């Protein structure tokens, strides 16, 4: 009958459907409406990167992220570089901090979605929750989770 016109950009304010999504009171389990990326980036994902300065003989692979705080400044407990190469190219694995364990991948950074921040992250550092590789965390959220003490909760 009677037709009117209202743009969808006026309703985008009501996009979040819960307290967790509107006020960010917890981890965004792949349910995030508003994203904040650096002004100028076209490929919309966050990047936790490392600096390579030498050969694997002098500079180890985990020493690339030494400029970051946390467990990347310690040597890992497990090392898979020697022997049969991992199918997913996991080079190192740090000690389990509660339900989270930090891994380092080989090759170009794989773009995954951290369930705590909700952002697509491209990095070689992946924190797996309870050995379940469906729930991964970027290294930044991993360091923040350990700092607050929420390692066994999130």
């Amino acid at each position: 009958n009677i037709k009117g016109g209202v743009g969808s950009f006026l309703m985008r304010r009501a996009a979040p459907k819960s307290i967790r999504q509107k006020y960010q009171t917890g981890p965004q389990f792949y349910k995030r409406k508003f994203f904040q990326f650096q002004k100028g980036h076209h490929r919309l994902h966050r990047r936790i990167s490392g600096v390579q300065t030498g050969s694997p003989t002098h500079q180890r692979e985990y020493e690339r992220f030494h400029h970051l705080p946390g467990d990347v400044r310690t040597r890992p407990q497990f090392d898979f570089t020697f022997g049969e190469t991992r199918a997913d190219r996991v080079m190192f694995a740090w000690r389990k901090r509660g339900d989270l364990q930090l891994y380092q991948m080989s090759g170009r950074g794989e773009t995954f979605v951290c369930y705590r921040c909700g952002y697509p992250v491209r990095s070689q550092l992946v924190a797996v929750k309870a050995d379940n590789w469906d729930y991964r965390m970027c290294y930044r959220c991993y360091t923040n989770t350990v700092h607050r003490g929420m390692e066994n909760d999130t």
Partner: peptide
């Protein structure tokens, strides 16, 4: 390290100048 979490990283050209030897 001067890296930080929010700051982006770059690949600096390795310094290949001739360095003086350390002393006791």
């Amino acid at each position: 390290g001067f890296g930080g979490f929010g700051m982006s990283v770059y690949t600096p050209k390795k310094d290949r100048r001739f360095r003086v030897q350390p002393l006791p």
